[PDB]
Structures are given as structure tokens and as C-alpha cells.
Design a protein around this ligand. Structure first.
Ligand SMILES: CC(C)O[C@H]1O[C@H](COS(=O)(=O)O)[C@@H](O[C@@H]2O[C@@H](C(=O)O)[C@@H](O[C@H]3O[C@H](COS(=O)(=O)O)[C@@H](O)[C@H](O)[C@H]3NS(=O)(=O)O)[C@H](O)[C@H]2OS(=O)(=O)O)[C@H](O)[C@H]1NS(=O)(=O)O
Length: 133
């Protein structure tokens, strides 16, 4: 487990977001938790349940993937949001400033085992993000 969640929940908390808030808020889930503001982020308007199914679609492979050789793409499209740091010179939350960018595309994810103390029902769960199309 990561310091405050499982890998699979932490992955969801960053990127899986069926009914989000606006970007100035949505970004806080890392930009107010990490030592600097990240410039760009992506937030898929889907359910974790679909993403657990996407870690049971046929196995493909991704750009930065050699330590598992396994990722997958979604079989039909979903809505999303993207966010954008409007002045790259902010490094902290007293000055970092953003705006919204909604969209509908497929997505690409990597995946690994369950957690000893959470939701055993599913042997393999998502855990990272590569791109959207
Ligand atoms: C295992 C753990 C440490 O990894 C998780 O957290 C790190 C940050 O580490 S930290 O929390 O311990 O401090 C996350 O990596 C940071 O986010 C990336 C992201 O893609 O979200 C990086 O983004 C930059 O590069 C992207 C290109 O890579 S690609 O998308 O894979 O092709 C760009 O598209 C993106 O715009 C850009 N953002 S930036 O602000 O301009 O840099 C970023 O490099 C990285 O931070 S850094 O300190 O390493 O530079 C992991 O994503 C995360 N893995 S997770 O647990 O699976 O989610």
C-alpha cells in the first residue's frame, strides 16, 4: 500500500472520476499533496468496475512498459476531463492557476494483482495510465 491508500484506490483517486468538480479543485488531489504543481492532468468520466473489466481485455504493450509487458485499451469510448496549468512559472498553490478541457476518447491502462486487505473478489486491478485517443 501507498502511505494513505491501496495502489488501485490511489490510481482511481487521481484518474477515474465519473462526476468531477472544476479543474482548480480537481488538481488539488496531487498539486496540494506533492512538492510542486504538475502542469497537466487527465480524469476519465467512468466507473472503476469498467476499468477492472479492462484488466481482463486482451493483453497489449505500451511505450514505458518493460517491467511487466502488459497494458490494455478500453473496448468502447468514455467521456473525460483534462486540466491545464495556465502559467508554468507557479510552483506552489498560492499562485498555480488552471482551466478546464472536456473530451470523449478511449484510454490505456496497466494493471496488477489485488491487495491482501481489500476487495478480493477481483484477482487483477488497474494501477497506471499511458494515454487517450
Ligand atoms: C510509483 C509512484 C512514485 O508513482 C506515482 O507518482 C509519481 C510522482 O511521484 S511522487 O508522487 O512520489 O512525487 C507520478 O509521476 C509524475 O506524473 C507523471 C504523469 O504522467 O502524470 C509525469 O507527467 C509528466 O510526463 C508526462 C509524460 O509521460 S507519459 O504520460 O507517461 O507519457 C506528461 O504528459 C505530463 O504532462 C508531465 N507533467 S509535468 O508536470 O509537466 O511533469 C511526471 O513526470 C511525474 O513526476 S516526476 O516527479 O517524476 O517528474 C506517477 O504517475 C505515479 N504512478 S501511479 O502511482 O501509478 O499513478
Amino acid at each position: 500500500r501507498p502511505p494513505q491508500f491501496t495502489r488501485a484506490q490511489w490510481f482511481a483517486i487521481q484518474h477515474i472520476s465519473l462526476n468531477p468538480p472544476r479543474c482548480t479543485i480537481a488538481m488539488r488531489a496531487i498539486n496540494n499533496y506533492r512538492w510542486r504543481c504538475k502542469n497537466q492532468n487527465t480524469f476519465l468520466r467512468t466507473t472503476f468496475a469498467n476499468v477492472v473489466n479492462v484488466c481482463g481485455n486482451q493483453s497489449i504493450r505500451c511505450p514505458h512498459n518493460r517491467t511487466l509487458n502488459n497494458c490494455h485499451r478500453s473496448r468502447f469510448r468514455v467521456p473525460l476531463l483534462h486540466c491545464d496549468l495556465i502559467n508554468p512559472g507557479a510552483q506552489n498553490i498560492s499562485n498555480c492557476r488552471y482551466a478546464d478541457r472536456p473530451g470523449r476518447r478511449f484510454y490505456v491502462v496497466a494493471c496488477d494483482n489485488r491487495d491482501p486487505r481489500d476487495s478480493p473478489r477481483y484477482p487483477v486491478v488497474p494501477v497506471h495510465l499511458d494515454t487517450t485517443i
